[PDB]
Design a protein around this ligand. Sequence first.
Ligand SMILES: [Cl-]
Length: 129
Amino acid sequence: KVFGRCELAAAMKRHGLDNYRGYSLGNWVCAAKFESNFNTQATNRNTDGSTDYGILQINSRWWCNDGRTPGSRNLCNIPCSALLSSDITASVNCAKKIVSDGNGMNAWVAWRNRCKGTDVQAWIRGCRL
Ligand SMILES: [Cl-]
């Protein structure tokens, strides 16, 4: 599923990401934009052999199981393929764990490099949220 901008904002909010660990909705929408371009089915291989999955490009080394990442943990206790569903529940549950891990949203390098410090509220402009 390729989400619309306000559509993903509404789902993220309904799932409780707005102000989660102090990160405003615009931060989460921004991260999704540059991680996946709002495409739930986005997958991207990492140099280390792991793969990122879904709207927030969650990695198979620590967070989800994809059967092909040696020495992997599955701390969200989900198959990585579940992070590609049209329903973002599994991605959101897992993202809550990731962001609570100690480094906040810096865990998303694209967030750090492209969203952090910027006018993130622009990502939710025009939305009936
Ligand atoms: Cl933080």
